[PDB]
Structure 1
Amino acid sequence: MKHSLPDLPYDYGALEPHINAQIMQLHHSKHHAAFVNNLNVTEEKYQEALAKGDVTAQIALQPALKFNGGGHINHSIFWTNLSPNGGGEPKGELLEAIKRDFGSFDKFKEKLTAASVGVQGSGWGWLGFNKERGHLQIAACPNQDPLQGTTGLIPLLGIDVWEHAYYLQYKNVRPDYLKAIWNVINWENVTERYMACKK
């Protein structure tokens, strides 16, 4: 296909003061850009290996494909989950699903925050939808491992806990970054992803 870096739906500084412009610029234009460039290179190498039936090469390329491929997937979703018009609480069917599956919105916040802060090293915190069980589910993924590709869950809301996502502003205080990000969550986008899972 030849993947490309998607344009951001807002200005790099639109999420201030919760996430500063310098992080957004570096996070989008440098880290994400690298994943897309390396993903395209990795996909081209795998196509050659498949043509020659080189199983050894296919397996050797799996870490680069998952790492760069997942990085493209994860960050592409991440940008749509944020908005300068975000924050507050969700409404409608998504709010009802959260109460049913987690009890209340506040308890959901605590569990997703704990899952994200509890990540040892680099990874992601995710609110996902389990098609088999038909309910919401919280999961954490290491490094750039994508939720759906590795767990089967449909991603609804992702929290990047890579140090590059918060270290320029919040230093080592990961909880402060988690507390601040709730102010810019685009619940409209999360709702659209949730409704897409239902019939």
Structure 2
Amino acid sequence: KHSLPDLPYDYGALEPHINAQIMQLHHSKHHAAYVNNLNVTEEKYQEALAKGDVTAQIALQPALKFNGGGHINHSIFWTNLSPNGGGEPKGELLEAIKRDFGSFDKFKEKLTAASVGVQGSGWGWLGFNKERGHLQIAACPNNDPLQGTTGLIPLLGIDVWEHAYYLQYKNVRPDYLKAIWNVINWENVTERYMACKK
């Protein structure tokens, strides 16, 4: 009942920033596996929930969280990126980024440190904190969802697992961070932003 979403562009669309080969492996291989493992795990859960088996239920948690998170995370990732993307946002979003981080440049600097800060697998996030309406920068381990574990609403996420860049950038996570700013689809981030204050 969960399906692999189609990329809103081609594998070679985010070039030269994101290599077309990484884009296919990432979408067709990695993301494909999460959706698949989520469906069996979710299905298995209904059988455990159905019998009242609390042991099977609790046992299936790491799998549900990891595959569930991977599906959530990557669905949002593709939409945050675009061949038509780049630069900086406008209107509401741009006024808020300024107001909260100092300037647009200070925001990037903070989202980059949070993304490189991750030790092991993980993600960097620009989210929205509902209690006291403000933007926030958070880092998540492995495939842990941003909203599912912190409550923040995901606006812009930066996959910082080694599979998201190693083929092209190798061990230099900072260079991957630098390049990626060019493909950020802000009208996507903006759309996500307007739906939070309402």
| Structure 1 position 142, deviation (Å) | 0.1
Residues 21-73 of structure 1 deviation map (CA, whole Å, 9 limit, x = unaligned): 00000000000000000000000000000010000110000000000000000
> Partners in 1 of 2:132 and 2:22 — Cα distance?
37
Corresponding residue SS for 1:69: helix
What is the TM-score when the length of structure 2 is the normalising length? Answer: 0.99
> Partners in 2 of 1:118 and 1:15 — Cα distance?
24
> Partners in 1 of 2:129 and 2:135 — Cα distance?
6
| Structure 1 position 164, deviation (Å) | 0.3
| Structure 1 position 198, deviation (Å) | 1.1
Corresponding residue SS for 1:197: coil
- 5+ residue gaps, structure 2, are none
Task: Look up the match of 1:96.
Answer: 95
> Partners in 2 of 1:100 and 1:49 — Cα distance?
48
Residues 116-164 of structure 1 deviation map (CA, whole Å, 9 limit, x = unaligned): 0010000000000001111000000000000000000000000000000
Corresponding residue SS for 1:164: helix
> Partners in 2 of 1:7 and 1:115 — Cα distance?
28
> Partners in 2 of 1:96 and 1:103 — Cα distance?
10
Query: How big is the alpha-carbon RMSD for the aligned residues of Structure 1 and Structure 2?
Result: 0.4
Corresponding residue SS for 1:37: helix
| Structure 1 position 188, deviation (Å) | 0.4
| Structure 1 position 76, deviation (Å) | 0.2
- 5+ residue gaps, structure 1, are none
Task: Look up the match of 1:193.
Answer: 192
Task: Look up the match of 2:148.
Answer: 149
> Partners in 2 of 1:64 and 1:83 — Cα distance?
30
Corresponding residue SS for 2:135: strand
> Partners in 2 of 1:175 and 1:185 — Cα distance?
16
What percent identity do the matched residue pairs reach?
Answer: 99
Corresponding residue SS for 1:87: coil
> Partners in 1 of 2:131 and 2:193 — Cα distance?
14
> Partners in 2 of 1:179 and 1:154 — Cα distance?
24
What is the TM-score when the length of structure 1 is the normalising length? Answer: 0.99
Q: Which runs of 4+ in 1 moved over 4 A?
A: none
Task: Look up the match of 2:60.
Answer: 61
> Partners in 1 of 2:138 and 2:100 — Cα distance?
14
